Design a protein around this motif. Structure first.
Motif, PDB file in Angstrom:
ATOM      1  N   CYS A  13       0.843  -1.185   0.000  1.00  0.00           N
ATOM      2  CA  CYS A  13       0.000   0.000   0.000  1.00  0.00           C
ATOM      3  C   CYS A  13       0.880   1.236   0.000  1.00  0.00           C
ATOM      4  CB  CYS A  13      -0.945   0.004   1.215  1.00  0.00           C
ATOM      5  SG  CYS A  13      -2.027   1.499   1.283  1.00  0.00           S
ATOM      6  N   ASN A  14       0.726   2.083  -1.006  1.00  0.00           N
ATOM      7  CA  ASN A  14       1.468   3.335  -1.075  1.00  0.00           C
ATOM      8  C   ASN A  14       0.521   4.463  -0.719  1.00  0.00           C
ATOM      9  OD1 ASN A  14       3.695   1.892  -1.882  1.00  0.00           O
ATOM     10  ND2 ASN A  14       3.440   2.349  -4.085  1.00  0.00           N
ATOM     11  N   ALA A  41      -6.246   5.192   3.543  1.00  0.00           N
ATOM     12  CA  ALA A  41      -5.831   3.882   3.063  1.00  0.00           C
ATOM     13  C   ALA A  41      -5.600   2.912   4.216  1.00  0.00           C
ATOM     14  CB  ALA A  41      -4.595   4.012   2.195  1.00  0.00           C
ATOM     15  N   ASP A  42      -5.288   3.425   5.413  1.00  0.00           N
ATOM     16  CA  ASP A  42      -5.159   2.562   6.589  1.00  0.00           C
ATOM     17  C   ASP A  42      -6.432   1.772   6.858  1.00  0.00           C
ATOM     18  OD1 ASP A  42      -2.689   2.382   7.670  1.00  0.00           O
ATOM     19  OD2 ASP A  42      -2.983   3.931   9.199  1.00  0.00           O
ATOM     20  N   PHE A  43      -7.600   2.382   6.632  1.00  0.00           N
ATOM     21  CA  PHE A  43      -8.831   1.607   6.775  1.00  0.00           C
ATOM     22  C   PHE A  43      -8.810   0.390   5.849  1.00  0.00           C
ATOM     23  CE2 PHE A  43     -10.178   6.055   7.842  1.00  0.00           C
ATOM     24  CZ  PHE A  43     -10.488   5.846   9.181  1.00  0.00           C
ATOM     25  N   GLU A  50       4.684  -0.995   2.767  1.00  0.00           N
ATOM     26  CA  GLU A  50       4.192   0.368   2.593  1.00  0.00           C
ATOM     27  C   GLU A  50       5.199   1.243   1.860  1.00  0.00           C
ATOM     28  OE1 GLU A  50       3.119   1.357   6.892  1.00  0.00           O
ATOM     29  OE2 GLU A  50       1.362   2.110   5.789  1.00  0.00           O
ATOM     30  N   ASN A  51       4.688   2.101   0.975  1.00  0.00           N
ATOM     31  CA  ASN A  51       5.430   3.221   0.396  1.00  0.00           C
ATOM     32  C   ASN A  51       6.742   2.774  -0.232  1.00  0.00           C
ATOM     33  OD1 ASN A  51       3.532   5.280   1.072  1.00  0.00           O
ATOM     34  ND2 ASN A  51       4.250   5.096   3.208  1.00  0.00           N
ATOM     35  N   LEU A  52       6.601   1.972  -1.284  1.00  0.00           N
ATOM     36  CA  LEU A  52       7.707   1.421  -2.040  1.00  0.00           C
ATOM     37  C   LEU A  52       7.776   2.079  -3.413  1.00  0.00           C
ATOM     38  CD1 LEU A  52       7.156  -2.458  -1.412  1.00  0.00           C
ATOM     39  CD2 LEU A  52       8.493  -0.841  -0.013  1.00  0.00           C
ATOM     40  N   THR A  53       9.002   2.227  -3.925  1.00  0.00           N
ATOM     41  CA  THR A  53       9.225   2.515  -5.339  1.00  0.00           C
ATOM     42  C   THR A  53       8.723   1.349  -6.192  1.00  0.00           C
ATOM     43  OG1 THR A  53      11.412   1.504  -5.269  1.00  0.00           O
ATOM     44  CG2 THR A  53      11.291   3.863  -4.799  1.00  0.00           C
ATOM     45  N   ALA A  54       8.526   1.614  -7.488  1.00  0.00           N
ATOM     46  CA  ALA A  54       8.098   0.540  -8.378  1.00  0.00           C
ATOM     47  C   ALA A  54       9.120  -0.585  -8.407  1.00  0.00           C
ATOM     48  CB  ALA A  54       7.851   1.080  -9.789  1.00  0.00           C
ATOM     49  N   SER A  74      -2.615   1.877  -4.470  1.00  0.00           N
ATOM     50  CA  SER A  74      -1.799   3.043  -4.787  1.00  0.00           C
ATOM     51  C   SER A  74      -2.607   3.919  -5.742  1.00  0.00           C
ATOM     52  CB  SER A  74      -0.458   2.621  -5.394  1.00  0.00           C
ATOM     53  OG  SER A  74       0.472   3.699  -5.358  1.00  0.00           O
ATOM     54  N   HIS A  75      -1.968   4.951  -6.299  1.00  0.00           N
ATOM     55  CA  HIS A  75      -2.481   5.515  -7.542  1.00  0.00           C
ATOM     56  C   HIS A  75      -2.174   4.557  -8.692  1.00  0.00           C
ATOM     57  CE1 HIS A  75      -3.254   9.243  -5.477  1.00  0.00           C
ATOM     58  NE2 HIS A  75      -1.989   9.317  -5.104  1.00  0.00           N
TER      59      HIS A  75
END
Length: 245
Positions: free
Chosen positions: A38-39, A51-53, A73-77, A105-106
């Motif tokens: 999840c980004n 997004a935490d929900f 969480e919050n990784l580069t591609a 993510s987006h």
């Protein structure tokens, strides 16, 4: 609450329809794995509030379905690729009957945005890469086993080798979303509806039936624009989860 399938129905369905059903491993030895990526914070894109929900609801749903859940969480591609490749070699898949990948993510048309994505300089995990990393050649531990891909990614020759990409189903919500104060209050509507339909229907209906009830709930005037879509279906059997067994 997650409704449970009786032990009687578990034994009956598995014996009487075995040729039609993905085989379930027995609970004692079973070691199902699931992965959530999840980004939420982006260098050049707006934050994804609430997004935490979605993480909380999916993690707990998947734990009720007897999956052990990893959250990233919050990784580069590029780090998403490495996380997926690492997940594919995990030993516990050998003693499992299935897996879930949940990706949030987006999104762009061709895939999922990593944290550093930009119009100038794209950072995208392509959908094609995901199926590649988990296909029949690159992930033997899961071959012949259902691989369920859940995607929440709002937008703003030599291909005949479909002998190798089998037993996938992708359920994606990539339609745009209007950002609003409400996002900090609740999760995504797709993830919410997914969770409740698993809770109401997984005890008696196979996975594709569960997904289709999700879509049914989106068949209202104000909701049909956000309708989620079943993609890259390659399942050769029905997947019954048998909540409880």
């Amino acid at each position: 609450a997650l409704k449970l399938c009786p032990h009687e129905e578990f034994l009956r369905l598995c014996k009487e329809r075995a040729e039609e059903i993905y085989p379930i491993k027995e609970r004692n030895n079973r070691t199902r794995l699931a992965l959530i990526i999840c980004n939420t914070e982006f260098d050049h894109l707006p934050p994804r509030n609430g997004a935490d929900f979605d993480i909380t609801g999916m993690k707990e749903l998947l734990e009720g379905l007897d999956y052990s859940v990893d959250v990233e969480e919050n990784l580069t591609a590029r780090d998403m690729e490495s996380a997926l490749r690492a997940f594919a070699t995990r030993p516990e898949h050998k003693s499992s009957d299935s897996t879930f990948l949940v990706l949030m993510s987006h999104g762009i048309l061709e895939g999922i945005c990593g944290t550093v994505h930009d119009e100038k300089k794209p950072d995208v995990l392509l959908y094609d890469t995901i199926f590649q990393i988990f296909n029949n050649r690159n992930c033997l531990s899961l071959k012949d086993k259902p691989k369920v891909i859940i995607v929440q990614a709002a937008r703003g020759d030599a291909v005949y080798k479909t002998h190798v990409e089998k037993d996938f189903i992708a359920f994606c919500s990539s339609t745009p979303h209007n950002v609003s104060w409400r996002d900090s209050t609740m999760g995504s509507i797709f993830i919410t509806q997914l969770i409740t339909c698993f809770q109401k229907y997984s005890w008696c209906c196979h996975l594709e039936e569960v997904f289709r009830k999700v879509q049914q709930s989106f068949e209202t005037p104000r909701a049909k624009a956000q309708m989620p879509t079943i993609e890259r279906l390659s399942m050769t059997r029905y997947f019954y989860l048998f909540p409880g067994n």
